[PDB]
Structure 1
Amino acid sequence: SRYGPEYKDPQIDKEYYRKPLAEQTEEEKYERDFKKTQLIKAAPATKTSSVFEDPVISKFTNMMMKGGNKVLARSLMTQTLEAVKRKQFAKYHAASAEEQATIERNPYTIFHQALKNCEPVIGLVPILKGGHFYQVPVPLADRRRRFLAMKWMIAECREKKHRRVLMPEKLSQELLEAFHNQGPVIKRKHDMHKMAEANRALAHYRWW
């Protein structure tokens, strides 16, 4: 907010800048962009042009940080990706050739998958009518859903571990079980879905 409304966001992707020549409306557009003498924001410190940056991992990284510890959250995440990695190597070498073709060794694909699979389709909002609060079925916008998945994973592997158990480990377990849909996280997604199905009549109430 030390930025006036005059300052537009930085677009940080390099592939965009290096290879413009085949795109007309985008050539027009970024021409408008810098030609407008557009005051543009100092790019954040978390966003980098690193080839290794996955925005989803960043968000999930943040939401795990208590206080101001980037260092610590970064480390816990790193250890989670790592933990899943090694756990999947262990599953690989102890398996049969068919399953060697099957198994996912990429902790990243495992992560985007275990989140795609944990995200609820519909969710509830309370509506006040005639004195009572009814929980009613609301279709959700994607970002809210992503958030719900991540929030759930973090809250689940935060709360229910036995104290001798480190975060990255349990988190890895929950990731791999949510991968196969058998994990408690998905039990949660399902209790959402069931609660929505029971109240489906009340989907009349919602006016928007």
Structure 2
Amino acid sequence: ARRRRAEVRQLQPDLVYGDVLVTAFINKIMRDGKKNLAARIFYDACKIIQEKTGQEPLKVFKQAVENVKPRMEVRSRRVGGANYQVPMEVSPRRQQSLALRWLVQAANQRPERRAAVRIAHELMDAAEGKGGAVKKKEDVERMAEANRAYAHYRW
């Protein structure tokens, strides 16, 4: 990215909810270009969301993903010869991409057999503010403050 700045790739909305967020989230589930399988596993969980709670999977997804949005992180700025781990803002772009990634990463971490059953639970506990995906969030935020001293390097 030494030249321009790179265009944040655009994305066709959901073939269902019409949500771009869901479109992206699917890609994270997607294994080896098999997009079909990914969507399937997602929607299967989507309905499972209601099967458990009288709530629709819509806001369950937003509520969840919004609780896994890390407010601030630690970037290692190697200035002054040494590599200081400075705490600073998370670009709105990152908060999303990271959340979704952690979401699915923590989801795969779950033990249960079927994959869609993991995306469901992880999604629920996430909106509930309790999931293991949230645990990575609570960490990165604390890891940021455990070094608030060097924050005077915030570029």
After TM superposition, the score normalised by the length of structure 1 is 0.64
| CA-to-aligned-CA distance 1:52-102 (integer Å, 9 cap, x gap) | 31111000011211111111111111111011121114xxxxxxxxxxxxx
Give the alignment of 1:14-33 within 5 angstroms: none
1:198 to 141, 146, 151: 146
Percent of aligned pairs sharing the same letter: 32
Q: Tell me, yes or no, if structure 1 residue 182 matches structure 2 residue 97.
A: no
Alignment match, 1:161: 110
List gaps (5 residues or longer) in structure 2.
1-9
Give the alignment of 1:54-65 within 5 angstroms: 54-65=19-30
**Bigger Cα Rg:** 1
Alignment match, 2:50: 85
- Cα RMSD between the aligned structures? 2.1
| CA-to-aligned-CA distance 1:139-185 (integer Å, 9 cap, x gap) | 12212101110010011112x233x6111111111111111112211
Query: Cα distance 1:176–1:141, how it changes in 2: closer, same or farther (>3 A)?
Result: same
Distance 1:181 1:49 in 2: 25
Query: What number of residue pairs does the alignment pair up?
Result: 146
List gaps (5 residues or longer) in structure 1.
1-43, 90-104
After TM superposition, the score normalised by the length of structure 2 is 0.85
| CA-to-aligned-CA distance 1:86-143 (integer Å, 9 cap, x gap) | 1114xxxxxxxxxxxxxxx111111011011111100111111344322111212212
Distance 1:139 1:63 in 2: 24
